[PDB]
Amino acid sequence: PRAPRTYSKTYSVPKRPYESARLDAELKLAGEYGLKNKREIYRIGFQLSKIRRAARDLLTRDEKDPKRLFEGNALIRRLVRIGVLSEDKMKLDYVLALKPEDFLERRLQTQVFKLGLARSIHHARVLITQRHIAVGKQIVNIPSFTVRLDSQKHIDFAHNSPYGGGRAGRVKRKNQGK
């Protein structure tokens, strides 16, 4: 038959289900960023856990090693590109110092709210899901869309959205049309 298509899990659950310190930290972190559930926090921790694992393996290698220089610079470049890592912290030792709030800062939902396009973080998610927000000239309705540094300046209302110069929506057309 046809070759199998690869797939993988993008999160991992905690080993201890009930822990007040972790439960309170997660809920506090979900409330700040308007997350739907704990899996959206597990996903960030999971992908951050493997960034650290890659950095740890390179840090065990000797300096000036060809693999450490090549993959280390590439890993740093990718994190700098999405704005998670600062431009003055390109050392692969600051990669280990990253925290989950650094990644949640770069979500589209967080950036819409912090750019003033929404009243609250929860207003940001519904604006995104309802096809009002466009990055560049492309409508993005994924709240977890990680905004790149070069995409930061091009976040705005979609040109065909009621809030961005489009026609009036379904509700208004029914009201002013009666």
Binding site: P1, R2, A3, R5, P66, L69, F70
Partner: protein
């Protein structure tokens, strides 16, 4: 099991064809021909995946049935004809001549050549021996049999085939300092000069080759193809890159400068 196989699963095809996993279950099984299955490039892959002249396998057969495609100066209508190293592909409708030479990345480059160079080819001498009625002959790497060769020609030499009469123009003896391309292994596609040939009776002889950047590598004698009489004097045009292997960091640096 009871006879020859006639299918080729997509995942089991040679990796240098650069076929995608999900386009289907099967891959073109090269026909029997001058080149081995694993070291060949079927014309269907060349005309559809490389040149993108044909959009699918039905169209490449339409192209070849109109007598357009020539391999080594002869019209071929077999869509899975196993074209190989040093073969010349001519499409006179587009006025294009290609030679199948490995690039340094291990794949068959799309290497366009002039019409004057498309009038000949090189072949590595595999064996020299006497045929019936005591007539000596040479077997090249592409299965050609040339009778009455120059009595100085021996194995591992390279002959220049006129490719229109099939005769030998002249040859290059295998010796130190000759220009070489590697046609097998992980050093496939690299170009350098022979530094030292290390003999192993009953085993595999090893050849030490020095790159133009003074990088030295070792490969089996069976993967060595003499392509020039000395450094910087190849008998065919080399593909872009000149068979010089760059490290991944060097390639990344080169791509950054090329794109700004």
């Amino acid at each position: 099991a009871r006879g020859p196989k006639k299918h080729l699963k997509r995942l089991a095809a040679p990796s240098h064809w650069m076929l995608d996993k999900l386009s289907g279950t099967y891959a073109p099984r090269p026909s029997a021909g001058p080149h081995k299955l694993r070291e060949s490039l079927p014309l269907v892959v060349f005309l559809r995946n490389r040149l993108k002249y044909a959009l699918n396998g039905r169209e490449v057969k339409a192209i070849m049935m109109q007598q357009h495609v020539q391999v080594d100066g002869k019209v071929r209508t077999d869509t899975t004809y196993p074209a190989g190293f040093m073969d010349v592909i001519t499409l006179e409708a587009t006025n294009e001549h290609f030679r199948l030479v490995y690039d340094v990345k291990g794949k068959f480059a799309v290497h366009r050549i002039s019409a004057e160079e498309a009038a000949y080819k090189l072949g590595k001498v595999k064996k020299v021996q006497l045929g019936k009625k005591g007539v000596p002959y040479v077997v090249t790497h592409d299965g050609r049999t040339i009778r009455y060769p120059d009595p100085l020609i021996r194995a591992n030499d390279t002959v220049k085939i006129d490719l229109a009469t099939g005769k030998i123009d002249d040859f290059i003896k295998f010796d130190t300092g000759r220009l070489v391309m590697v046609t097998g292994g992980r050093n496939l596609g690299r170009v350098g000069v022979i530094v030292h040939r290390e003999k192993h009776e009953g085993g595999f002889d090893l050849v030490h080759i020095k790159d133009a950047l003074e990088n030295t590598f070792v490969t089996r004698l069976s993967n060595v193809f003499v392509i020039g009489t000395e450094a910087g004097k190849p008998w065919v045009s080399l593909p872009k890159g000149k068979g010089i292997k760059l490290s991944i960091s060097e390639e990344r640096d080169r791509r950054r400068a090329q794109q700004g």
